[PDB]
């Protein structure tokens, strides 16, 4: 996201605006204002690694912008928008992840390496790799009888098509020592 | 299958295998293979 301080009515601020957005969801519901539109209308920009070197980015578009004039005890503890030089803003941090990891629920609550395993394990799972399995002659293939979409999700999943082609089931789980088995 | 298509190799202990800062936003921080080619195989 581009933050250019172009706000003659205030501080520095994101080019894209609630209208731009509500204008997108307009085209969503219709299934004309694409991605390329957000791009050519100089609203968002493609920052390679090199260029990244010379810019300042804010996490939450919000929080990291308005002024400072109480705080929730349960929520974590974020730092701040200690800046005004903000050239760009992160579409959403969760996008640092990749396909695999993007299915892990609350990854930001697990010991770093745990997330690495579940990342390579989800690849050993069983599900519905395609709906045309019935018609493929692939050597070896596993389809889960009754797939379920997960109860806990990731906004990221939606694009990965996880709820439509899951790979697992929601089981009532108890955490207890029982027969010692 | 998605994951396999967005996969990277790094033909070749220490420097390369590690997660760099410049890796933020481009490569996944958690998804990499264990042992042997750890950190050498990355995922976009």
């Amino acid at each position: 996201f581009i933050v250019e301080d172009d706000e003659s009515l205030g501080h520095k601020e994101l080019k894209v605006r609630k209208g731009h957005i509500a204008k997108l969801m307009a085209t969503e519901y219709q299934d004309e204002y694409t991605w390329s539109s957000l791009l050519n209308e100089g609203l968002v920009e493609y920052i390679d690694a090199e260029e990244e070197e010379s810019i300042l980015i804010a996490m939450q578009p919000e929080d990291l912008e308005p002024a400072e004039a109480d705080v929730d005890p349960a929520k974590r503890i974020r730092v701040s928008h200690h800046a005004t030089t903000f050239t760009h803003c992160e579409i959403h941090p969760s996008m640092i992840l990749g396909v695999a990891a993007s299915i892990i629920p609350f990854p930001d609550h697990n010991q770093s390496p745990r997330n690495t395993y579940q990342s390579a394990m989800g690849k050993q799972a069983m599900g519905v790799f395609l709906t045309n399995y019935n018609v493929r002659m692939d050597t070896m293939a596993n389809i889960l009888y009754y797939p379920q979409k997960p109860l806990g999700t990731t906004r990221a999943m939606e694009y990965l098509k996880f709820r439509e082609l899951p790979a697992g089931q929601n089981a009532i789980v108890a955490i207890a020592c029982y027969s010692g088995y | 299958t998605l994951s396999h298509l967005r996969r990277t190799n790094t033909p070749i202990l220490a420097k390369p295998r590690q997660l760099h800062n410049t890796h933020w936003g481009l490569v996944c921080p958690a998804e990499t293979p264990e042992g042997q080619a750890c950190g050498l195989v990355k995922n976009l």
Binding site: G19, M95, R155 | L2
Partner: peptide, 30 residues
């Protein structure tokens, strides 16, 4: 106010837009 700011939940709409156009394997194709 087709020019008001844009909070959290908003970003998603954009992200949706991205994938609408590019798709999960753009790279390989392009």
């Amino acid at each position: 106010d087709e020019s008001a700011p844009i909070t959290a939940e908003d970003s998603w709409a954009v992200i949706s837009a991205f994938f609408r156009e590019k798709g999960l394997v753009s790279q390989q194709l392009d």
